[PDB]
Amino acid sequence: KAAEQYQGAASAVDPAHVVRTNGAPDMSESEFNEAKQIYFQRCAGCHGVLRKGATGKPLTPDITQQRGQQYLEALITYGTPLGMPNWGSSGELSKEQITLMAKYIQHTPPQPPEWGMPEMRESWKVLVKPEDRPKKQLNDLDLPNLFSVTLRDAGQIALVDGDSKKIVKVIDTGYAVHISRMSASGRYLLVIGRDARIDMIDLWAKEPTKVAEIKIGIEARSVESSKFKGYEDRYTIAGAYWPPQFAIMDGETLEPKQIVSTRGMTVDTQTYHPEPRVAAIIASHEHPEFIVNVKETGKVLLVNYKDIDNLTVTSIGAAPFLHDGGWDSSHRYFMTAANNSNKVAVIDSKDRRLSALVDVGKTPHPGRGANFVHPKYGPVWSTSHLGDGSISLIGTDPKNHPQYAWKKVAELQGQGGGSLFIKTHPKSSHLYVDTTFNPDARISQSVAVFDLKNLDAKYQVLPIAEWADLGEGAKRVVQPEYNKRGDEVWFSVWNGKNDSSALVVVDDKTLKLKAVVKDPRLITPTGKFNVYNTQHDVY
Amino acid sequence: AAEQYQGAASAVDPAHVVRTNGAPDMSESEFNEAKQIYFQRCAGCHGVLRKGATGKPLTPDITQQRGQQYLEALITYGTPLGMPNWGSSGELSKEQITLMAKYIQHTPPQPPEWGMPEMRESWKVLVKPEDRPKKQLNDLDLPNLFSVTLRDAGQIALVDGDSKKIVKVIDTGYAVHISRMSASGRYLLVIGRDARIDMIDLWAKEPTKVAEIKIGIEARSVESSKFKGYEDRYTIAGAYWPPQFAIMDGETLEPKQIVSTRGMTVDTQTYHPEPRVAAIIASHEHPEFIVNVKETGKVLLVNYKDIDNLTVTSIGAAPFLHDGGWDSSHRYFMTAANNSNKVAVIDSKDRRLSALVDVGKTPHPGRGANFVHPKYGPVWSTSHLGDGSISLIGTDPKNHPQYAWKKVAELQGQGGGSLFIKTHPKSSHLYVDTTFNPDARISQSVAVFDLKNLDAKYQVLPIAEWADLGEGAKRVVQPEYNKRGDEVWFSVWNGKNDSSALVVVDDKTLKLKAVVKDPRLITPTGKFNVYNTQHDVY
Ligand code: DHE
Ligand code: DHE
Ligand code: HEC
Ligand code: HEC
Ligand SMILES: [Cl-]
Ligand SMILES: [Cl-]
Ligand SMILES: [O-]
């Protein structure tokens, strides 16, 4: 009873300021559930699970009830010129469904489940123990020139032989794999589904097979491996959208070791955000650390894994809505884009500080980017945009080019907006830019190609989808990617699940069609990752 | 383009996203009546989101599982595991108990957040640093000054150590929990349970405030940078609500950084929506702050070398971290994980957990008591709330490795309900209070041990009786020495409508030396001698 009286006094919290949430329009289970289904299918991607993920005012009951039914129905029906699509005018949703959505967002957001160590360990599986694995490569494949291609809707990936242009093996994975990464030893391929399911693949088995799997959350986009000298295959890390966390696992068995929450304060307003989704992750070559991007809070965390028992993290403020990015030519400065902020943040992995914030076009989407030496400006890194058809060129040589370092030194103009990936190679004199989400069929079905030796000349349009000879469907082209020797560039013709897709290969030296990869198993091909170029960050 | 880019369905499955309810309907006045009682009688232990106590959380998934009649029965009769009985004791009525059972079956109401906009708004620079004196403009003996908390009055009193008189009374936040000194010895920092901080300049004609700010809705700790070359550089504070800690300018109190403590636990490694910040201590080995995170049982090493890009080292200890203090060398932080019945040892130099020592039932050391044992060498001691034991733990890995981080021995006090143990380098006595012991006489007195003869039983000093105050519980709490170390002060914490006092004992003779009475001395609690606090002399 002593300790009971010790903790007996009243809380300093004032009961009058603790608020009960409600005042929302009544809706039955049937109604609420119908709206909820539409929300996660059509609205969650942008607005998040807790509805504070998009720009502008959140869809939380404090704001939505302020607006009212009529305002909400009207906004959902016609959308806004600032990124909010129209659901009524387009005919996507009915007025009955819209009335339900307006009522739905006036209620407290329903909570998805958490995903802690117990859930992770339960999902963890060692298919083949390290001891039972081969001591050397048991097949005669040219592993470095292998391509890990995502068979999105089929929940698989396919290993495609670079030179033979044929599928060597199809592997079952998590749903709609987002990216594929290579371990520092060049032996293990890591893939992560958008459902947060990771699969570890041993390229040395007679037939490349999975040796381990685990689920790190409910939804995720990124996975990465330790690339600092002396740590080959030591640790694997992955970022989840939900729950807002990232986990570190054993690089050899995928055993969950540490789980860290990213819920916290924003860089701009320094206010609390309950859903800071983890975006791009890149491994540092300067220190034994992982560079993790936190979207909504706009924070870049340097997670040191020299000692994972007592985790040391350095939090660098950048800019809101961090997404994708990649190394500069020297592999020291992490060029990442804060797309909704229309800026590119530059992270010095050596000094461990924000080198700069560069103003670019509308919604930068570099991917990993494209590096090359500009005649006039020296070493640069480039990115295309979703919001416009411009290409930003940024100086990345502070040491020998201080006049151009971290400055949007110049621009280029591609076919138009809706661009996703820009690309080049050290041995190439070409710069490729796609237009996957451009509203025009012809533009979305082709790629622009610039001449690095003559940047003043207009790009040449390569009819990628046309060359595929596939028939009907949107046939959107996406992410250009080089081979080991980078004497040929690959593209994906992302056609419908019930349509016909293909991989188109172009001779980089001549800009001529070289091969077209077709197979009934090649369903909804999206991302493609050459083993060598991915492992050694060649872009 | 961007609308089609971010247009695919979320991987989150709608069928697993749950809408909450199935709770017993209650009107606004019924809900508010129950809510008021919750924060007044239950929040302390269970927390705002009701996941703060041991055992099962009071969240709707568990409470609705238990049912209305199970909940009423438990609230009425309590349990022998830390849950008080509210019906049997007659504290709450059956109508109120029914309202509470219904209340906990509903989603926990949410108090507001408190970020940078709220902090800068509460921020006030009363006297700019350039307008502050360049020298001590008074004749006071600052180092032997005592900062006494006048809890219920929302003030503190500066009492002159040698003269025994109140030098000044200052208006502060409600119920200040602790006083702390800047490394320069010039500034006094106080923080109320309401999270309001006040910076006082002891060099002014009259010791007055020069700045203040609110860093939350509820807090308990505040600290100053004590690493060499960082004198009055930064000031940190931990809050209960929201679960965060903030770093400010050690000269103006200007909010700089705010970090959330919400995260995974050390044991189950699961998410905890309310890990509250406890004790905080400034490292002397590295320019960093050592912060304790209760519920998640984590000890963070917040480096302020570069306040723009904060680097934090998270060290897992044990759940329910609370208070603690340095060993004799000021290298190892001895903190208690009360509900786990353990004391964690954090090596601030090597920056790792040196060990987990098993002690008594609910250890409550405060800052602890360091002294050299005749046999086991240098030790660090603590008393308990759960029992009458006193643990002695070896703290010398270099010259006494065989006793390092071990419960080397045990002493026995008057009983449970103990809050603080104390000693001094110049003293040969060890004092331990028993503030919350259910027996009036035991709670109104303290035990004193002879460090030159630990085998001998303690002596009992009638502190409250010596005060001659009349009626009231007259609970005695927290012994504290003067800079010299020949005087030991005690607070006689009586009701606000009763008479309280500070009793001072001659440590050399164990005889009454003085009694401080004043109509302004209302509900005196914590007393902090300037020198001993500033230099961690304990
Ligand atoms: C955070 C993130 C990364 C960086 C990972 C890294 O390198 O660590 C990334 C990279 C990528 C990369 C990396 C390419 C590279 O060369 O590095 C690819 C191929 C890719 C295919 C797609 N992405 Fe991606 N992508 C998201 C998130 C991300 N995508 C989304 O949340 C978004 C906007 C909506 C969604 O539904 O997921 C989205 C849409 C897409 C697509 O439309 C693509 C083409 C197909 C799909 O399945 O969604 N994302
Ligand atoms: C986190 C924490 C510390 C360590 C701070 C540091 O070192 O930086 C501390 C220290 C302290 C210290 C430090 C003493 C020292 O010598 O270091 C004092 C005087 C003190 C007086 C009280 N404490 Fe305290 N105290 C709490 C929390 C804490 N108390 C509670 O939450 C609790 C259990 C319940 C409550 O109602 O606050 C509680 C009850 C009490 C009391 O009942 C006291 C006697 C009076 C009061 O106002 O609550 N606490
Ligand atoms: C700390 C001194 C407490 C105060 C004040 C209150 N509660 Fe508590 N409660 C506490 C503990 C340590 C425990 C677990 C005890 C055990 O035997 O497991 C509890 C438990 C409860 C429960 C039951 C939980 C369950 O098993 O389903 C209830 C319903 C409960 N407490 C309610 C509650 C209320 C409403 C209180 C204020 C009027 C209250 N508790 C105060 C510790 C403490
Ligand atoms: C991204 C491609 C979006 C999708 C898909 C949906 N919304 Fe959206 N929404 C988005 C943005 C960028 C904004 C801000 C627009 C602005 O001009 O400020 C919004 C805003 C809304 C609002 C209004 C909020 C307010 O100002 O009070 C509502 C009510 C809203 N969005 C609802 C909503 C629903 C129900 C959706 C799916 C059926 C949905 N949005 C999709 C971005 C995007
Ligand atoms: Cl934070
Ligand atoms: Cl965490
Ligand atoms: O992407």
Ligand SMILES: [O-]
């Ligand atoms: O305390």
